[PDB]
Write a structure and sequence with these properties.
Bound molecules: adenosine-5'-diphosphate
Helix content of chain A: 40-55%
Number of helices of chain A: 22
Largest interface: A-C, 107 and 106 residues
Binding site for ATP (chain C): 46-53
Distance between the termini of chain A: 67 Å
Oligomer: part of a larger assembly
Region (AAA-ATPase) (chain C): 42-170
Strand content of chain A: 5-15%
Subcellular location (chain C): Chromosome, Centromere; Nucleus; Chromosome
Protein name (chain C): ATPase histone chaperone YTA7
Number of strands of chain A: 10
Largest sheet of chain A: 5 strands, parallel
Family (chain C): Belongs to the AAA ATPase family.
Chain lengths: 579, 35, 576, 57
């Protein structure tokens, strides 16, 4: 498992590639610059992030990409605590021999995949069998003798399960957070996986796939492209799934269409949906007339709250490209003063969205979390607190806030606040409020709470008074007449379609070839206006849930007679329903 | 000492070459009877 | 060995497992052309005896075991972990090197919930190490070889969630308790190598009788019926201590042997708690058919079970065989936006008086919804496992209902469930259902006995949207009671020559070679039916079954009498 | 299907509650009944059998 995958195979991690070149390749080529300051290169990175992000890919591409010259880098790889046996002996002895052979072949990379099983946290019981491994690992990584040019890479899902003595300079001085990729990196990953293909996709289709794959990791995008290719093989040549002998196919005219990716997106459940929090996704295309007038206002409010569109400082996506394309230019009064006055724009980012019961809050929260793409969402909803049965409520809240305190652009997310303040114990709200008041002002931890019919007396002199929800209460009002008109106009556009436009599949007239083994639509425009007026007058002062109820109830009636050309019976049934 | 030499990876390799060498000694006895 | 023709049902999974075991080996240029890798790892999950090990063995010994032989390593999850402190990780490494050197290979971890459970308990630190070496060993996205890891389990939430990701176990296959067509296919597979094979109307009635059975229970049924036929056709070979009384094959397994094997074999769906999904029994059916069908009609309206012309989910390979393809863009996303716009919020609250057959209506509705993912939030389904809290079990059941999208969250006995379940996890379930999108197909089916509607519009269940979707089971009508009490009359009118009693044979068992009209006027029948309906006035199903049992004991007590005047008089004397 | 369903319809809801004054020989009546129903499968639900095992609730 150490293939020809290089640095053009990875997409969207261009900042850590520069640092890994800075600490693996560049000491070999230029030892005169590192010895000019009497500095050793940094050696040993802990990769950590969500699963399916590119840690093992980055390790293999670091092993293969810096070895393209005649300066070979051996790649010793260890799975997570496969090294220990039933006796006391070989667990430390095999690490001894591993570090000795890495000392021998001097430019080397030891890669500990899943190091949280090899070096766990010192618990209360069962001390011996892991502490005797952590001790020899710590004494071998940063011992008295020079380890040599052995670059130690570890990889994990969470870094707190590793021992804190490992997270120390000399052993794991750099800690790289591999993030779930944004839309440009998802574009680049989709361009990389669909690069070898004979009939390549268009650019705008890869753009629409990058928008449709929100929440996908890199491994999920690879599985999506693999399942799209497999559905294309099933669509072009089904007969290979029935014979047991190898038929003769040709690897042409098997081009992947859009309809294969649209089924692969239904077969693939991402790692965002496997989580228990609110998955960030845009507003669906049905209810986008109903809510995007008053979601945009929220975006404007967040643009005045978090300074998203005003990014002149803290624009560090890649420091090396920053040093390449831009240019430098007393010392305190040109850097520290302006950095303080640029960081002093975030005062206390809070936002409480409060609308009536059923007014689309489950969509508005996910749309806001989709807008805040570069933020770290930490869900403090009830299911994520009680899902880990070993933790307590208080420990889960403290763990989520401390995870939000690092990776500082972060959002603490409490959906269903009316349920939350009624079913969480009262001391946990005080713990969270003490954690929020023990923050600095310039820290970008946004508190985003969505509520259904929450009384303002609870945020005025109640149990949410210590969160400063003073000016930051946004009211989701009920949708107006024009939004309901556009919603039901899409419904009417469904109604006045022809049965030749309604997609029914086929029945094929001829079977598949065996392989050599080796009327007019009658609907007056007055009836459309009557149905639209009845839909408008029936849904007076309704919420989004009642509008979706009426929309489903009318879409059932319309899809009943999807083949009938006389649409007078379905108009009569629609007007009869709304009475 | 042989509790230290006999380790299950070498044990499974030695069962592989044990069936190989069982087959080897069988073919070699029939070879020395036929020649 | 086992091939793919020994598997009943599961043809979708047979077509989907051939693109990662057979077709990678057979067609290596059609997978290299797209620069793709087969998924390489599946999680089989389902009830015990559904065919997971059979599917793994068929996938091993069926996909071209002629020159490209696929080896097969069968391990149990409790076998790998031992009493020592480093044996399990090293044994996993030995198994993966042994499968790597024999390169086309299938590792099968049976009951993987013991090897890699969920992290909610269990200190002494060794299970984290075993889970970490398992996660690092089945890396399916760095070309470890041609190892396919197949992990079998009962429910997939008993497996660590880090293993249910791409690279690890990619696809999860639900292996269900088989329906009537799949039980027909299974009983045809088991009765194919016989010498006197059964008919089609025989296997149809056996598939109708075997409700709540699996594959292993049907195998034991066929084996025990064959054993009863050997025990019945030639019974002299048992008690006789002598030598071989050899006998030819005039044996034929008739109805009276399967009917004894059906009461001698208990299913594995009689061990799980709650309502086993099965239709209404033939006795109570005239009491509860007319109110069931309306429910089915309601479930046909709010779930789109009949007009599912866009969601006809079978093996889509068969769709590409028998159909053909077809601006051109809009006709996908517009009609898929208006096709999923029919499910708005599927809720249902069946609420009747106490004892009105709700334990039958729940099982009949769950039998109607066979293609759904039933997640049972019953009391005994949550308090049985001590490894999880009620909170975490409810959340994980909801999340498994959310992943597999056609699903039913089923809460039997809601009037108890709002009293012996704390308000915290009820509000958790409310917040979980409130965070769902409207176009999500999670039906919340609740069945309650004598629940007040004040708890539904003002109480703890007010945030579940049971406002219009309350169905009221009422007590059965007089025309239904008249048909329900029309097997007692047809047991009162059967003469004792048709009651299958036992009479001793006048001649002994041979040995082989050593190498009237019953007195019942129709006025009596009319008076019995009239008093039997006049007693059961405004009664429930439980009280009607009590009257039915208490009259059936009186009838079956005097089952050899030929003058039924005493039985009629005792029936009228009881119902007074 | 008729006679097996009318033979299985003779059990409706088998329940019994023996209730007498304090000390009126209940510990003997229960043992004599559980000896009379010796073909059954007795599941004791008394307190001494539930609180005995410390792992299960
Ligand atoms: N950032 C990325 N760019 C390109 N490909 C990626 C990226 N992240 C993941 N992949 C693809 O996903 C596959 C699996 O990644 P993996 O090594 O399993 O990551 P992790 O170990 O973090 O789960 C790789 O083969 C790679 O092709
Ligand atoms: N779908 C099926 N079709 C045919 N036979 C089956 C099926 N499922 C189970 N069987 C029978 O049951 C046995 C398989 O049991 P097993 O695979 O151990 O079930 P599980 O994997 O659920 O424990 C086989 O001997 C087979 O005869």
């Amino acid at each position: 498992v150490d293939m020809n995958v290089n640095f053009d195979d990875i997409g969207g991690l261009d900042n850590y590639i520069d640092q890994l070149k800075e600490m693996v390749a560049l000491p070999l080529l230029y030892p005169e610059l590192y010895q000019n300051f009497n500095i050793t290169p940094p050696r040993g990175v802990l990769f950590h992030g969500p699963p399916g992000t590119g840690k093992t890919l980055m390790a293999r591409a670091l092993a293969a990409s810096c070895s393209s010259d005649e300066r070979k880098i051996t790649f010793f790889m260890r799975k997570g605590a496969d090294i220990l046996s039933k006796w006391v002996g070989e667990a430390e002895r095999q690490l001894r021999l591993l570090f000795e052979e890495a000392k021998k072949h001097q430019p080397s990379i030891i890669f500990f995949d899943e190091i949280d099983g090899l070096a766990p946290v010192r618990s209360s019981k069962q001390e011996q069998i892991h502490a005797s491994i952590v001790s020899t690992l710590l004494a071998l990584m940063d011992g008295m003798d020079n380890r040599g040019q052995v670059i130690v890479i570890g990889a994990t899902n969470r870094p707190d399960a590793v021992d804190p003595a490992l997270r120390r300079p000399g052993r794991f001085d750099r800690e790289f957070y591999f993030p779930l990729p944004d839309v440009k990196a998802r574009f680049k990953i989709l361009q990389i996986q669909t690069r070898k293909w004979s009939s390549p996709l268009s650019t705008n289709f890869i753009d629409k796939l990058a928008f449709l794959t929100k929440g996908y990791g890199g491994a999920d995008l690879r599985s999506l492209c693999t399942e799209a290719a497999l559905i294309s093989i099933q669509r072009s040549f089904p007969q290979i799934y029935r014979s047991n002998d190898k038929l003769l196919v040709d690897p042409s005219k098997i081009k992947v269409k859009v309809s294969d990716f649209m089924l692969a997106l239904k077969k693939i459940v991402p790692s965002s949906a496997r989580s228990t929090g609110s998955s960030p996704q845009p507003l669906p295309e049905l209810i986008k007339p109903l809510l995007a007038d008053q979601l945009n206002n929220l975006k404007n409010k967040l643009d005045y709250m978090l300074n998203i569109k005003d990014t002149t400082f803290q624009r560090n996506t890649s420091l090396l490209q920053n040093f390449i394309d831009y240019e430098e230019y007393s010392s305190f009064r040109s850097y520290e003063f302006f950095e303080s006055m640029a960081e002093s724009q975030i005062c206390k980012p809070r936002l409480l969205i409060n609308g009536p019961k059923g007014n689309g809050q489950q969509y508005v929260g996910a749309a806001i979390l989709n807008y805040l793409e570069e933020f770290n969402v930490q869900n403090l909803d009830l299911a994520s607190l009680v899902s880990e049965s070993s933790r307590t409520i208080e420990a889960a809240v403290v763990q989520s806030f401390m995870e939000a305190k690092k990776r500082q652009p972060s959002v603490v997310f409490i959906p269903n606040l009316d349920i939350w303040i009624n079913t969480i114990p009262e001391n946990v709200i005080l713990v969270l409020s003490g954690l929020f008041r023990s923050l600095q002002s310039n820290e970008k931890i946004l508190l985003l709470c969505l509520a259904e019919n929450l009384d303002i007396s609870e945020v005025k002199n109640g149990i949410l008074s210590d969160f400063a929800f003073d000016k930051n209460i946004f009211q989701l009002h009920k949708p107006s007449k024009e939004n309901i008109t556009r919603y039901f106009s899409n419904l009417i556009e469904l109604l006045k379609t022809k049965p030749s436009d309604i997609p029914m599949k086929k029945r094929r007239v001829k079977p598949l070839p065996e392989l050599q083994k080796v009327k007019e639509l009658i609907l007056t425009p007055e009836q459309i206006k009557k149905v639209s007026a009845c839909l408008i007058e029936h849904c007076q002062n309704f919420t989004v849930s009642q509008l979706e109820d009426v929309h489903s109830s009318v879409a059932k009636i319309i899809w009943k007679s999807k083949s009938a050309w006389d649409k007078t019976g379905t108009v009569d049934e629609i007007i009869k329903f709304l009475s | 000492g042989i509790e230290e030499i006999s380790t299950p990876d070498f044990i499974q390799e030695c069962k592989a070459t044990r069936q190989r060498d069982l087959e080897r000694q069988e073919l070699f006895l029939e070879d020395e009877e036929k020649r």
